[PDB]
């Protein structure tokens, strides 16, 4: 959910 995350 954070915009910098790469994987769910």
């Amino acid at each position, epitope marked *: *959910a*954070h*915009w*910098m*995350d*790469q*994987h769910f």
Partner: antibody, heavy 117, light 113 residues
Framework: QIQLVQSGPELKKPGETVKISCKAS????????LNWVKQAPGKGLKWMGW????????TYADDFKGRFAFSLETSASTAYLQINNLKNADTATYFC??????????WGQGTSLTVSS | DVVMTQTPLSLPVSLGDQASISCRSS???????????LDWFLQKPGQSPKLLIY???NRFSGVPDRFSGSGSGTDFTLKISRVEAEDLGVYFC?????????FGGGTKLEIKR
């Protein structure tokens, strides 16, 4: 045992190009974002943008659109920062930092860049 | 872009004393998922930032028990319960709630005389 190791100090002239590396160890490189941060002598930290280490897609902050390029060597768990058409105002320490869950949790040691004619 | 304002700019302490540093943001740092992406870092001269506290109040692994964080919304505090020599340096807050991430200007923890 997580570590980000950056390339060594650079001295360059205005108009030249420089490429700085950031090699990651101790985790799966493609799982987490890598961020670039500028620290000009006695100035506040400035976020430059990030690269998605899985897709390779870069995102540039508004002051770093134009002459800055983020790239990867995923095979070597290494990220690169290239600065083209160097200006005097590019003089600074550049850091890479891992982004995990919205936090810059591990930083590189920094790469000093000095720009002078 | 969100402005992060730290107070004071310089904090004199005696070794063994408590220290408190403030960080205020120009906007709420609550994200749409309910998290507050406010972190605290120590930077020593010629070295990189080291994470102390993440998401307001979570102590990062390896960080001594004497560091703690508190606060909510736009108003945040880092406390050191008993200052040691290794703790002198510059403390910075960061937010990543809003793009672009931004940083406070830093608070220097120094020796009182």
């Amino acid at each position: 045992q997580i570590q980000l190791v950056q390339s060594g100090p650079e001295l360059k002239k205005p108009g030249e190009t420089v490429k700085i590396s950031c090699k990651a160890s101790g985790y799966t490189f493609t799982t987490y974002a890598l961020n670039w941060v500028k620290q000009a002598p006695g100035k506040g930290l400035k976020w430059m943008g990030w690269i998605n280490t899985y897709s390779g897609v870069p995102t540039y902050a508004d002051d770093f659109k134009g002459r800055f390029a983020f790239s990867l060597e995923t095979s070597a768990s290494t990220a690169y920062l290239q600065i083209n058409n160097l200006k005097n105002a590019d003089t600074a320490t550049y850091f890479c930092a891992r982004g995990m869950s919205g936090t810059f949790d591990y930083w590189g040691q920094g790469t000093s860049l000095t720009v002078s004619s | 872009d969100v402005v992060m304002t730290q107070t004071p700019l310089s904090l004199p302490v005696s070794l063994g004393d408590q220290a408190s540093i403030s960080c205020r943001s120009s906007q709420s740092l609550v994200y749409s998922n309910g998290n507050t992406y406010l972190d605290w870092f120590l930077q020593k001269p010629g070295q990189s930032p080291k994470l102390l506290i993440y998401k307001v109040s979570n102590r990062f692994s390896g960080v001594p028990d004497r560091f703690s964080g508190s606060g909510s919304g736009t108003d945040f505090t880092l406390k050191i319960s008993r200052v040691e020599a290794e703790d002198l340096g510059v403390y910075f807050c960061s937010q990543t709630t809003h793009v672009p991430p931004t940083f406070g200007g830093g608070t220097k923890l120094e020796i009182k005389r």
